[PDB]
């Protein structure tokens with residue numbers, strides 16, 4: 001809850017976290033980012049040598065701490081092969097640390113922006129994301145922020161979802177959400193046109209991420225977000241630049257992800273059965289694109 005006190009926030013985090021100081025467990029500190037959500041490092045588990053990613057947050061400068069608690073709890077209880085592994089958390093005064101596996105392959109955004117994926121490689125990424133989405137949805141978790149930025153890549157071509165800061169946890173009692181939380185360009189039209197959306201908003205975004213993999217950008221990226229949202233609600237299913245360049249089974253897959261009618265849009269479970277995913281190259285096929293993008297970036 002947003003009204004929960006500073007001190008009740010701290011007591012709850014104290015109960016979640018491992019005891020003591022995280023330097024008691026890590027060493028390779030390179031800062032790899034900073035900003036509103038906190039500061040990110042790569043580091044090394046001192047004990048095991050595992051490379052990790054660590055976010056450090058000052059709770060004093062954290063506006064919405066309920067969402068940080070939620071994010072860790074969701075990660076902890078929703079472990080999956082296709083979700084970046086949550087390892088540990090520490091609280092030292094007002095300083096919160098969250099430790100994750102590190103994926104040395106970077107973001108899918110780098111890949112879509114610096115290389116040109118083939119349909120075999122696209123099918124493999126979509127499959128792996130749909131594996132995480134089937135698992136989430138069946139556990140009543142909606143990611144709500146699916147986009148290339150939130151897919152991370154191993155050097156072996158592992159595909160892992162990240163950034164559950166905006167996820168919703170639903171129940172049969174309240175199966176639908178209304179909050180507009182996701183990144184504009186990837187938002188399903190029903191997020192703006194109604195006040196009741198479910199898990200299939202993640203399928204829509206997945207479909208937008210497939211357009212990224214084909215074209216390099218989601219539709220309307222050059223638009224102000226405010227215009228993009230009106231455009232999604234009024235254009236509906238986005239149009240491809242060059243649909244003739246795509247295989248018939250890939251075009252069918254995209255149409256199933258980007259169906260205007262939520263009922264008719266595929267669920268993650270249904271789409272795991274799609275024949276487009278059958279042309280998937282081994283995930284190792286992604287390694288030259290990942291290495292080429294790492295190089296460019």
Ligand SMILES: CCn1c(=O)c(-c2ccc(-c3cncs3)cc2Cl)cc2cnc(Nc3ccc(N4CCN(C)CC4)cc3)nc21
Pocket residue numbers: 040041053054055068071072075084086098099100101102103104105106107110152162163164294297
């Ligand atoms: C995107 C950076 N990144 C992460 O942020 C997190 C992360 C995710 C969630 C959480 C949670 C916080 N509270 C509850 S859960 C905490 C962390 Cl640390 C994990 C992570 C894992 N691997 C990576 N890898 C990675 C490697 C390189 C790059 N690059 C590509 C090359 N560019 C030049 C710079 C950045 C991006 C991501 N980054 C991560």
Ligand SMILES: [Cl-]
Pocket residue numbers: 036037038039056057058059061062
């Ligand atoms: Cl911070």
Ligand SMILES: [Cl-]
Pocket residue numbers: 102103104105153154155156
């Ligand atoms: Cl890796």
